[PDB]
């Protein structure tokens, strides 16, 4: 949907090197706004974008106690997971969680999320109805029956439909100058001969926000999906993103190829050709 709030939790055990590390990060769309790391000398939750700094001392204290409590909880969970999988206390393991809410165009909950993974594999996930669960194996099935018994989905549903939506709306107001501002991509095409009979055409898209973009190469109006090399969208470091799509074409036929760029920061789709 139009906007979303997401918190990412990562807990990692490291036998022989102290207690398990717990990291938590929060995002509103593609913008990180908070961070917490139990390995920081004097662990506190820190601001990562200007608009969250206006929050008072009690917001920071409340955040910190939640993440400190989570550190303890996930340390217990890593120990429990070992028993469920008959694993020894000599290995290093990871539990990841990702939860949050999506706001639709009208400002109400579009859909909620809450998923957990163990060692990079799905473990348990809250269903879209925000009432039931999907467990990936017989181990997660135990967690599931425990969560059904403690009525956990109900707690999550209350959060996702209420607080998550209220706070996301508040952050969007407070950070409107950036959160609700799309930066269109600055586009250009490059030419790189590979031999006498072929040249590489590269369509670039730089400086855009948000990350979502579409770059297509077309030969006489036909989508060259099979011959286009695309790089994964990458961050620039200043909040914006970059991406390029390339195609190897026969020398002299460059003008039969067009690059199509789609991004919400653009009034209407761009069509680029290589101008020599």
């Amino acid at each position: 949907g139009s906007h979303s709030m997401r918190y990412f939790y990562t807990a990692m055990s490291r036998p022989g090197r102290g207690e398990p590390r717990f990291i938590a990060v929060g995002y509103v769309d593609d913008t990180q706004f908070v961070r917490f790391d139990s390995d920081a000398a004097s662990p506190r939750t820190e601001p990562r974008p200007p608009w969250i700094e206006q929050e008072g001392p009690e917001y920071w204290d409340r955040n910190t106690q939640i993440f400190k409590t989570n550190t303890q909880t996930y340390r217990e969970n890593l120990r429990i997971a070992l028993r469920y999988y008959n694993q020894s206390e000599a290995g290093s393991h990871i539990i990841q969680r990702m939860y949050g809410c999506d706001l639709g165009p009208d400002g109400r909950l579009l859909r909620g999320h809450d998923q957990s993974a163990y060692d990079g594999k799905d473990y348990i996930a809250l269903n879209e109805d925000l009432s039931s669960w999907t467990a990936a194996d017989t181990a997660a099935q135990i967690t599931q029956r425990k969560w059904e018994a403690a009525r956990v989905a109900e707690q999550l549903r209350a959060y996702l439909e209420g607080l998550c939506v209220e706070w996301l709306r508040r952050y969007l107001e407070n950070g409107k100058e950036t959160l609700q501002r799309a930066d269109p991509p600055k586009t250009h095409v490059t030419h790189h001969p590979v031999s006498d009979h072929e040249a590489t055409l590269r369509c670039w898209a730089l400086g855009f926000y948000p990350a979502e973009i579409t770059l297509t190469w077309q030969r006489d109006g036909e989508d060259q999906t099979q011959d286009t090399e695309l790089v994964e969208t990458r961050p620039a470091g200043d909040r914006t993103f970059q991406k390029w799509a390339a195609v190897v074409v026969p020398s002299g036929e460059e003008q039969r190829y067009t690059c199509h760029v789609q991004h919400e920061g653009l009034p209407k789709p761009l069509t680029l050709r290589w101008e020599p």
């Binding site: 217990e76 429990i80 967690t143």
Partner: peptide
């Protein structure tokens, strides 16, 4: 604001 819910596996 994160959720105030802590449940074990």
């Amino acid at each position: 604001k994160p959720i105030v819910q802590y449940d074990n596996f």
